[PDB]
PDB file of C-alpha atoms in Angstrom:
ATOM      1  CA  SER A   5       2.810  16.758  12.651  1.00 39.60           C
ATOM      2  CA  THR A   6       2.442  13.079  13.621  1.00 40.59           C
ATOM      3  CA  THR A   7       4.943  10.433  12.438  1.00 42.94           C
ATOM      4  CA  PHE A   8       4.315   7.975   9.603  1.00 44.77           C
ATOM      5  CA  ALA A   9       4.327   5.098  12.061  1.00 41.65           C
ATOM      6  CA  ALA A  10       1.656   7.042  13.938  1.00 41.80           C
ATOM      7  CA  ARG A  11      -0.654   7.431  10.974  1.00 40.24           C
ATOM      8  CA  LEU A  12      -0.085   3.847   9.903  1.00 37.66           C
ATOM      9  CA  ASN A  13      -0.630   2.392  13.340  1.00 39.24           C
ATOM     10  CA  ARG A  14      -3.794   4.521  13.541  1.00 41.61           C
ATOM     11  CA  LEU A  15      -5.174   2.677  10.475  1.00 40.22           C
ATOM     12  CA  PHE A  16      -4.344  -0.727  11.870  1.00 41.83           C
ATOM     13  CA  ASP A  17      -5.939   0.271  15.160  1.00 42.49           C
ATOM     14  CA  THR A  18      -9.053   1.778  13.588  1.00 38.89           C
ATOM     15  CA  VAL A  19     -10.009   0.512  10.080  1.00 38.89           C
ATOM     16  CA  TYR A  20     -11.268  -3.065   9.823  1.00 42.71           C
ATOM     17  CA  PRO A  21     -14.481  -4.920   8.930  1.00 41.11           C
ATOM     18  CA  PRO A  22     -17.543  -5.662  11.094  1.00 43.22           C
ATOM     19  CA  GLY A  23     -17.809  -8.974  12.889  1.00 44.60           C
ATOM     20  CA  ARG A  24     -14.045  -8.937  13.384  1.00 42.52           C
ATOM     21  CA  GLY A  25     -10.816  -7.438  14.718  1.00 41.05           C
ATOM     22  CA  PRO A  26      -8.019  -5.180  13.419  1.00 42.36           C
ATOM     23  CA  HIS A  27      -6.207  -6.398  10.317  1.00 43.38           C
ATOM     24  CA  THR A  28      -2.790  -7.947  10.919  1.00 44.34           C
ATOM     25  CA  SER A  29       0.338  -6.608   9.169  1.00 42.96           C
ATOM     26  CA  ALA A  30       0.321  -9.971   7.385  1.00 43.31           C
ATOM     27  CA  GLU A  31      -3.096  -9.900   5.676  1.00 42.09           C
ATOM     28  CA  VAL A  32      -1.625  -6.704   4.394  1.00 42.04           C
ATOM     29  CA  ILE A  33       1.504  -8.338   3.049  1.00 42.49           C
ATOM     30  CA  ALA A  34      -0.673 -11.059   1.547  1.00 40.93           C
ATOM     31  CA  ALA A  35      -3.251  -8.579   0.227  1.00 44.05           C
ATOM     32  CA  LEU A  36      -0.553  -6.676  -1.635  1.00 45.27           C
ATOM     33  CA  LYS A  37       0.908  -9.958  -2.865  1.00 45.41           C
ATOM     34  CA  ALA A  38      -2.443 -10.854  -4.467  1.00 46.80           C
ATOM     35  CA  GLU A  39      -2.079  -7.760  -6.659  1.00 42.75           C
ATOM     36  CA  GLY A  40       1.556  -8.181  -7.575  1.00 44.12           C
ATOM     37  CA  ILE A  41       3.119  -5.747  -5.129  1.00 44.40           C
ATOM     38  CA  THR A  42       5.900  -7.337  -3.126  1.00 44.51           C
ATOM     39  CA  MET A  43       6.399  -5.994   0.453  1.00 46.95           C
ATOM     40  CA  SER A  44       8.539  -7.605   3.168  1.00 45.45           C
ATOM     41  CA  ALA A  45       7.185  -8.436   6.658  1.00 47.09           C
ATOM     42  CA  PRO A  46      10.464  -7.172   8.209  1.00 47.26           C
ATOM     43  CA  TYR A  47      10.032  -3.920   6.262  1.00 49.21           C
ATOM     44  CA  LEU A  48       6.393  -3.416   7.160  1.00 47.15           C
ATOM     45  CA  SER A  49       7.429  -3.850  10.786  1.00 46.90           C
ATOM     46  CA  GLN A  50      10.334  -1.375  10.968  1.00 43.80           C
ATOM     47  CA  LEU A  51       7.859   0.940   9.227  1.00 45.03           C
ATOM     48  CA  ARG A  52       5.341   0.614  12.042  1.00 46.94           C
ATOM     49  CA  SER A  53       7.902   0.832  14.867  1.00 47.54           C
ATOM     50  CA  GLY A  54       9.403   4.013  13.521  1.00 44.98           C
ATOM     51  CA  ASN A  55      12.815   2.581  12.681  1.00 46.44           C
ATOM     52  CA  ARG A  56      12.133   2.983   8.948  1.00 46.11           C
ATOM     53  CA  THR A  57      10.855   6.437   8.239  1.00 44.32           C
ATOM     54  CA  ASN A  58      10.632   8.244   4.903  1.00 43.04           C
ATOM     55  CA  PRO A  59       9.161   5.509   2.612  1.00 44.99           C
ATOM     56  CA  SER A  60       8.561   6.115  -1.104  1.00 45.61           C
ATOM     57  CA  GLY A  61       5.282   7.366  -2.508  1.00 44.91           C
ATOM     58  CA  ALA A  62       4.499   3.926  -3.912  1.00 47.91           C
ATOM     59  CA  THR A  63       4.646   2.133  -0.577  1.00 49.15           C
ATOM     60  CA  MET A  64       2.370   4.782   0.910  1.00 48.31           C
ATOM     61  CA  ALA A  65      -0.117   4.493  -1.909  1.00 46.65           C
ATOM     62  CA  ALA A  66       0.043   0.706  -1.408  1.00 46.43           C
ATOM     63  CA  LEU A  67      -1.024   0.780   2.249  1.00 45.71           C
ATOM     64  CA  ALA A  68      -3.432   3.723   1.882  1.00 45.09           C
ATOM     65  CA  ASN A  69      -4.984   1.364  -0.672  1.00 43.65           C
ATOM     66  CA  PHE A  70      -5.315  -1.773   1.460  1.00 46.32           C
ATOM     67  CA  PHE A  71      -7.238   0.443   3.862  1.00 48.57           C
ATOM     68  CA  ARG A  72      -9.183   2.015   0.965  1.00 50.07           C
ATOM     69  CA  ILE A  73      -8.242   5.544   2.094  1.00 46.76           C
ATOM     70  CA  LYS A  74      -6.592   8.256  -0.050  1.00 44.93           C
ATOM     71  CA  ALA A  75      -2.799   8.368   0.116  1.00 43.80           C
ATOM     72  CA  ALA A  76      -3.163  12.054   0.986  1.00 46.58           C
ATOM     73  CA  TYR A  77      -3.938  10.734   4.442  1.00 48.10           C
ATOM     74  CA  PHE A  78      -0.148  10.384   4.650  1.00 47.77           C
ATOM     75  CA  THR A  79       1.094  13.686   3.270  1.00 46.69           C
ATOM     76  CA  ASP A  80      -1.411  16.477   3.799  1.00 46.60           C
ATOM     77  CA  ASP A  81      -2.158  17.221   7.435  1.00 47.44           C
ATOM     78  CA  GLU A  82      -5.309  18.972   6.349  1.00 47.42           C
ATOM     79  CA  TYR A  83      -6.927  15.773   5.043  1.00 43.74           C
ATOM     80  CA  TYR A  84      -5.099  13.812   7.691  1.00 44.42           C
ATOM     81  CA  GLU A  85      -7.232  16.021   9.894  1.00 44.01           C
ATOM     82  CA  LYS A  86     -10.486  15.696   7.955  1.00 44.64           C
ATOM     83  CA  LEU A  87     -10.164  11.913   8.017  1.00 44.61           C
ATOM     84  CA  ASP A  88      -9.024  11.438  11.622  1.00 46.43           C
ATOM     85  CA  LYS A  89     -12.311  12.737  12.999  1.00 45.74           C
ATOM     86  CA  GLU A  90     -14.051  10.137  10.832  1.00 45.05           C
ATOM     87  CA  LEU A  91     -11.444   7.646  11.988  1.00 44.91           C
ATOM     88  CA  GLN A  92     -12.245   8.544  15.553  1.00 46.32           C
ATOM     89  CA  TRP A  93     -15.908   8.195  14.717  1.00 48.78           C
ATOM     90  CA  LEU A  94     -15.398   4.539  13.833  1.00 51.92           C
ATOM     91  CA  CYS A  95     -14.082   3.751  17.295  1.00 51.87           C
ATOM     92  CA  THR A  96     -17.095   5.265  19.044  1.00 52.94           C
ATOM     93  CA  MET A  97     -19.645   3.285  17.050  1.00 57.03           C
ATOM     94  CA  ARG A  98     -18.618  -0.203  18.206  1.00 54.82           C
ATOM     95  CA  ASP A  99     -18.072   1.031  21.789  1.00 54.40           C
ATOM     96  CA  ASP A 100     -20.502  -0.792  24.077  1.00 58.33           C
ATOM     97  CA  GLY A 101     -21.376   1.926  26.584  1.00 61.34           C
ATOM     98  CA  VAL A 102     -22.093   4.167  23.621  1.00 59.42           C
ATOM     99  CA  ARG A 103     -24.231   1.595  21.830  1.00 59.05           C
ATOM    100  CA  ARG A 104     -26.263   1.068  25.006  1.00 59.23           C
ATOM    101  CA  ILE A 105     -26.762   4.801  25.557  1.00 58.10           C
ATOM    102  CA  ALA A 106     -27.936   5.719  22.048  1.00 55.72           C
ATOM    103  CA  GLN A 107     -30.022   2.551  22.145  1.00 54.74           C
ATOM    104  CA  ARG A 108     -31.831   3.535  25.349  1.00 56.41           C
ATOM    105  CA  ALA A 109     -32.120   7.215  24.365  1.00 53.68           C
ATOM    106  CA  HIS A 110     -33.548   6.831  20.851  1.00 50.04           C
ATOM    107  CA  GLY A 111     -37.278   7.480  21.050  1.00 51.76           C
ATOM    108  CA  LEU A 112     -36.887  10.092  23.742  1.00 50.01           C
ATOM    109  CA  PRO A 113     -38.157  13.532  22.586  1.00 50.67           C
ATOM    110  CA  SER A 114     -35.764  16.365  21.687  1.00 52.02           C
ATOM    111  CA  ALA A 115     -36.001  17.922  25.165  1.00 50.80           C
ATOM    112  CA  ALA A 116     -35.206  14.809  27.168  1.00 48.95           C
ATOM    113  CA  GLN A 117     -32.407  13.813  24.822  1.00 48.06           C
ATOM    114  CA  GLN A 118     -30.689  17.187  25.039  1.00 45.19           C
ATOM    115  CA  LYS A 119     -31.198  16.729  28.788  1.00 45.51           C
ATOM    116  CA  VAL A 120     -29.219  13.548  28.292  1.00 43.65           C
ATOM    117  CA  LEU A 121     -26.350  15.468  26.708  1.00 46.96           C
ATOM    118  CA  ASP A 122     -26.268  18.041  29.533  1.00 47.87           C
ATOM    119  CA  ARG A 123     -25.635  15.098  31.876  1.00 45.79           C
ATOM    120  CA  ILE A 124     -22.796  13.550  29.894  1.00 48.18           C
ATOM    121  CA  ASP A 125     -21.156  16.946  30.090  1.00 46.82           C
ATOM    122  CA  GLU A 126     -21.711  17.031  33.858  1.00 50.74           C
ATOM    123  CA  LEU A 127     -19.936  13.691  34.002  1.00 51.04           C
ATOM    124  CA  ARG A 128     -17.049  14.867  31.809  1.00 49.66           C
ATOM    125  CA  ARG A 129     -16.568  17.698  34.285  1.00 50.12           C
ATOM    126  CA  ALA A 130     -16.688  15.272  37.241  1.00 48.79           C
ATOM    127  CA  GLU A 131     -13.975  12.963  35.885  1.00 46.61           C
ATOM    128  CA  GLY A 132     -11.507  15.611  34.696  1.00 46.63           C
ATOM    129  CA  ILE A 133     -12.061  14.931  31.011  1.00 51.56           C
ATOM    130  CA  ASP A 134     -12.998  18.591  30.623  1.00 52.62           C
TER     131      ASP A 134
ATOM    132  CA  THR B   6     -33.851 -13.725   2.972  1.00 53.23           C
ATOM    133  CA  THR B   7     -32.416 -13.449  -0.603  1.00 51.20           C
ATOM    134  CA  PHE B   8     -28.830 -13.232  -2.021  1.00 50.24           C
ATOM    135  CA  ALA B   9     -29.710 -10.038  -3.833  1.00 48.24           C
ATOM    136  CA  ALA B  10     -30.998  -8.417  -0.590  1.00 51.63           C
ATOM    137  CA  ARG B  11     -28.033  -9.607   1.429  1.00 53.12           C
ATOM    138  CA  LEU B  12     -25.470  -8.580  -1.158  1.00 52.23           C
ATOM    139  CA  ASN B  13     -26.868  -5.052  -1.440  1.00 55.14           C
ATOM    140  CA  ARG B  14     -26.999  -4.743   2.375  1.00 55.95           C
ATOM    141  CA  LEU B  15     -23.213  -5.067   2.285  1.00 57.82           C
ATOM    142  CA  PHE B  16     -22.713  -2.463  -0.453  1.00 57.72           C
ATOM    143  CA  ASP B  17     -24.834  -0.074   1.545  1.00 60.84           C
ATOM    144  CA  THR B  18     -23.519  -0.857   5.033  1.00 61.82           C
ATOM    145  CA  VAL B  19     -19.811  -1.811   4.477  1.00 63.77           C
ATOM    146  CA  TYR B  20     -17.624   1.046   3.095  1.00 64.92           C
ATOM    147  CA  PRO B  21     -14.419   3.013   4.031  1.00 62.69           C
ATOM    148  CA  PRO B  22     -14.295   6.200   6.220  1.00 60.62           C
ATOM    149  CA  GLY B  23     -15.236   9.682   4.983  1.00 57.55           C
ATOM    150  CA  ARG B  24     -16.570   8.088   1.825  1.00 59.48           C
ATOM    151  CA  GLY B  25     -19.756   6.427   0.435  1.00 58.15           C
ATOM    152  CA  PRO B  26     -20.968   2.928  -0.517  1.00 56.49           C
ATOM    153  CA  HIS B  27     -18.889   1.271  -3.238  1.00 53.91           C
ATOM    154  CA  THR B  28     -19.952   0.855  -6.866  1.00 57.45           C
ATOM    155  CA  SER B  29     -20.177  -2.374  -8.905  1.00 60.24           C
ATOM    156  CA  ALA B  30     -17.429  -1.102 -11.192  1.00 59.83           C
ATOM    157  CA  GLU B  31     -15.247  -0.784  -8.142  1.00 60.49           C
ATOM    158  CA  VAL B  32     -15.700  -4.330  -6.794  1.00 59.46           C
ATOM    159  CA  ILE B  33     -15.064  -5.313 -10.402  1.00 59.17           C
ATOM    160  CA  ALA B  34     -11.835  -3.402 -10.692  1.00 60.38           C
ATOM    161  CA  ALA B  35     -10.832  -4.555  -7.215  1.00 61.06           C
ATOM    162  CA  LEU B  36     -11.268  -8.187  -8.316  1.00 63.37           C
ATOM    163  CA  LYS B  37      -9.385  -7.631 -11.579  1.00 63.06           C
ATOM    164  CA  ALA B  38      -6.472  -6.223  -9.594  1.00 58.65           C
ATOM    165  CA  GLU B  39      -6.277  -9.475  -7.656  1.00 60.15           C
ATOM    166  CA  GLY B  40      -6.327 -11.432 -10.901  1.00 61.70           C
ATOM    167  CA  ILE B  41      -9.956 -12.304 -10.337  1.00 62.60           C
ATOM    168  CA  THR B  42     -12.361 -11.954 -13.176  1.00 62.11           C
ATOM    169  CA  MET B  43     -16.081 -11.510 -12.894  1.00 62.48           C
ATOM    170  CA  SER B  44     -18.484  -9.966 -15.342  1.00 63.56           C
ATOM    171  CA  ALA B  45     -19.915  -6.533 -14.511  1.00 63.11           C
ATOM    172  CA  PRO B  46     -23.149  -7.411 -16.353  1.00 56.50           C
ATOM    173  CA  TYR B  47     -23.188 -10.508 -14.168  1.00 55.93           C
ATOM    174  CA  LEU B  48     -22.670  -8.539 -10.958  1.00 57.37           C
ATOM    175  CA  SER B  49     -25.491  -6.178 -11.888  1.00 59.25           C
ATOM    176  CA  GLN B  50     -27.933  -9.034 -12.498  1.00 60.41           C
ATOM    177  CA  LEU B  51     -26.836 -10.451  -9.121  1.00 61.42           C
ATOM    178  CA  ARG B  52     -27.973  -7.271  -7.330  1.00 61.90           C
ATOM    179  CA  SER B  53     -31.186  -7.006  -9.311  1.00 60.74           C
ATOM    180  CA  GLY B  54     -32.535 -10.548  -8.825  1.00 60.66           C
ATOM    181  CA  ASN B  55     -32.040 -11.462 -12.472  1.00 62.07           C
ATOM    182  CA  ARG B  56     -29.741 -14.225 -11.398  1.00 60.97           C
ATOM    183  CA  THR B  57     -29.813 -16.149  -8.175  1.00 60.19           C
ATOM    184  CA  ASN B  58     -27.676 -19.017  -6.912  1.00 61.76           C
ATOM    185  CA  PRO B  59     -24.128 -17.737  -7.416  1.00 62.60           C
ATOM    186  CA  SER B  60     -21.192 -20.144  -7.336  1.00 64.00           C
ATOM    187  CA  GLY B  61     -19.126 -20.442  -4.200  1.00 65.32           C
ATOM    188  CA  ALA B  62     -16.234 -19.301  -6.347  1.00 64.96           C
ATOM    189  CA  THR B  63     -18.288 -16.087  -6.707  1.00 65.83           C
ATOM    190  CA  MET B  64     -19.552 -15.797  -3.155  1.00 64.15           C
ATOM    191  CA  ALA B  65     -15.844 -16.271  -2.447  1.00 61.94           C
ATOM    192  CA  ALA B  66     -14.754 -13.327  -4.613  1.00 61.64           C
ATOM    193  CA  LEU B  67     -17.434 -11.043  -3.126  1.00 61.69           C
ATOM    194  CA  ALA B  68     -17.090 -12.130   0.533  1.00 61.48           C
ATOM    195  CA  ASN B  69     -13.299 -11.733   0.213  1.00 59.75           C
ATOM    196  CA  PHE B  70     -13.826  -8.218  -1.094  1.00 59.83           C
ATOM    197  CA  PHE B  71     -16.221  -7.131   1.655  1.00 57.94           C
ATOM    198  CA  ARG B  72     -13.721  -8.838   3.992  1.00 59.92           C
ATOM    199  CA  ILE B  73     -16.433 -10.839   5.651  1.00 61.38           C
ATOM    200  CA  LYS B  74     -17.080 -14.549   5.612  1.00 63.19           C
ATOM    201  CA  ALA B  75     -18.806 -16.182   2.693  1.00 60.26           C
ATOM    202  CA  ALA B  76     -21.003 -17.651   5.471  1.00 59.48           C
ATOM    203  CA  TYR B  77     -22.947 -14.409   5.263  1.00 61.89           C
ATOM    204  CA  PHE B  78     -24.959 -15.481   2.238  1.00 60.35           C
ATOM    205  CA  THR B  79     -25.339 -19.068   3.398  1.00 64.08           C
ATOM    206  CA  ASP B  80     -25.849 -19.432   7.196  1.00 59.77           C
ATOM    207  CA  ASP B  81     -28.947 -17.778   8.727  1.00 57.84           C
ATOM    208  CA  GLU B  82     -27.260 -17.597  12.136  1.00 57.31           C
ATOM    209  CA  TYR B  83     -23.889 -16.013  11.254  1.00 55.54           C
ATOM    210  CA  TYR B  84     -26.034 -13.840   9.018  1.00 51.64           C
ATOM    211  CA  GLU B  85     -28.085 -12.579  11.962  1.00 46.67           C
ATOM    212  CA  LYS B  86     -24.898 -12.526  13.998  1.00 47.11           C
ATOM    213  CA  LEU B  87     -23.110 -10.418  11.447  1.00 47.86           C
ATOM    214  CA  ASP B  88     -26.191  -8.448  10.462  1.00 46.90           C
ATOM    215  CA  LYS B  89     -26.491  -7.158  14.027  1.00 47.47           C
ATOM    216  CA  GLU B  90     -23.117  -5.528  13.333  1.00 48.11           C
ATOM    217  CA  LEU B  91     -24.313  -3.664  10.259  1.00 46.95           C
ATOM    218  CA  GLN B  92     -27.474  -2.444  11.979  1.00 48.34           C
ATOM    219  CA  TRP B  93     -25.256  -0.821  14.615  1.00 48.18           C
ATOM    220  CA  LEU B  94     -23.446   1.083  11.895  1.00 43.18           C
ATOM    221  CA  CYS B  95     -26.991   2.106  10.870  1.00 42.85           C
ATOM    222  CA  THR B  96     -28.581   3.133  14.148  1.00 43.98           C
ATOM    223  CA  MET B  97     -25.415   5.264  14.282  1.00 44.40           C
ATOM    224  CA  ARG B  98     -26.167   7.488  11.333  1.00 43.21           C
ATOM    225  CA  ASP B  99     -29.544   8.093  12.954  1.00 43.08           C
ATOM    226  CA  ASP B 100     -29.277  11.835  13.430  1.00 47.52           C
ATOM    227  CA  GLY B 101     -28.888  13.171  16.945  1.00 44.73           C
ATOM    228  CA  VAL B 102     -27.445   9.786  17.806  1.00 43.45           C
ATOM    229  CA  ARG B 103     -24.031  11.081  16.710  1.00 44.65           C
ATOM    230  CA  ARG B 104     -24.290  14.192  18.924  1.00 42.85           C
ATOM    231  CA  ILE B 105     -24.842  12.058  22.008  1.00 44.38           C
ATOM    232  CA  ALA B 106     -22.517   9.236  21.002  1.00 47.69           C
ATOM    233  CA  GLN B 107     -19.371  11.208  20.309  1.00 50.74           C
ATOM    234  CA  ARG B 108     -19.398  12.671  23.790  1.00 53.07           C
ATOM    235  CA  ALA B 109     -20.320   9.680  25.961  1.00 52.50           C
ATOM    236  CA  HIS B 110     -17.120   8.247  24.491  1.00 53.19           C
ATOM    237  CA  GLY B 111     -14.440   9.491  26.924  1.00 55.33           C
ATOM    238  CA  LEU B 112     -16.453   8.552  30.047  1.00 54.44           C
ATOM    239  CA  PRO B 113     -15.375   5.807  32.513  1.00 55.79           C
ATOM    240  CA  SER B 114     -17.896   2.952  32.815  1.00 54.38           C
ATOM    241  CA  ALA B 115     -19.057   3.998  36.277  1.00 52.85           C
ATOM    242  CA  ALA B 116     -19.698   7.354  34.583  1.00 53.47           C
ATOM    243  CA  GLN B 117     -21.445   5.852  31.572  1.00 50.02           C
ATOM    244  CA  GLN B 118     -23.608   4.071  34.112  1.00 48.06           C
ATOM    245  CA  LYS B 119     -24.530   7.434  35.647  1.00 46.16           C
ATOM    246  CA  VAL B 120     -25.892   8.261  32.167  1.00 50.02           C
ATOM    247  CA  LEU B 121     -27.965   5.133  31.485  1.00 49.15           C
ATOM    248  CA  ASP B 122     -29.261   5.867  34.963  1.00 48.30           C
ATOM    249  CA  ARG B 123     -30.385   9.348  33.869  1.00 48.04           C
ATOM    250  CA  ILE B 124     -32.023   8.140  30.660  1.00 47.82           C
ATOM    251  CA  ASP B 125     -34.257   5.810  32.582  1.00 44.79           C
ATOM    252  CA  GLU B 126     -34.913   8.869  34.791  1.00 44.10           C
ATOM    253  CA  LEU B 127     -36.247  10.680  31.724  1.00 41.03           C
ATOM    254  CA  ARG B 128     -38.785   7.953  30.930  1.00 43.06           C
TER     255      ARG B 128
END
């Protein structure tokens, strides 16, 4: 469904360590280099801009590997789908508002926390999200 | 407040999505692949408190696998700085935290305020 630049850009935008920001296409190049694999900055770019589509299975393994995710992220929608929800998960942890909310709501009973959820939903109706 | 405790914290807290904590064999293989060589027996002692006081060269190898700074094992401030980050990842497996969290996500800040406002209401 989604393009290969889409899936790749989703990993750059989403997977990266704590206490820091998104990896740069060049820690990548360097990270491959430190394991023999030789990949060109200009190539990695055209890949991520959608000018270079249809890479070989080896290049896709290579990147899927820097990110530590199965290459089947790139070729089966089904697992592209299983993983993307988890991907999406990442972004929400590490979102301030969210951290504050679950912070302040932990230690509320099950009735008053559910009551908290009924209110988020109110607010998602109010803003046109739902 | 040990290198064992701090190393294991990482294993437990820092792993890829839709997956589990890494395994010593992994980190091993992952070092190999970069032309770095470290003994598995060694690594295992290092998590068990059979050896302390690992060489920088080694706190290098590990901190460059976890993709964090080798300052983690050394500086008590960047430790607490960085450790706050892991404990978020934690608090966020906390069940029923995920149910709330994954919704509050789309909401504008003025809207997320209207929530924090309601949680205080519940207290």
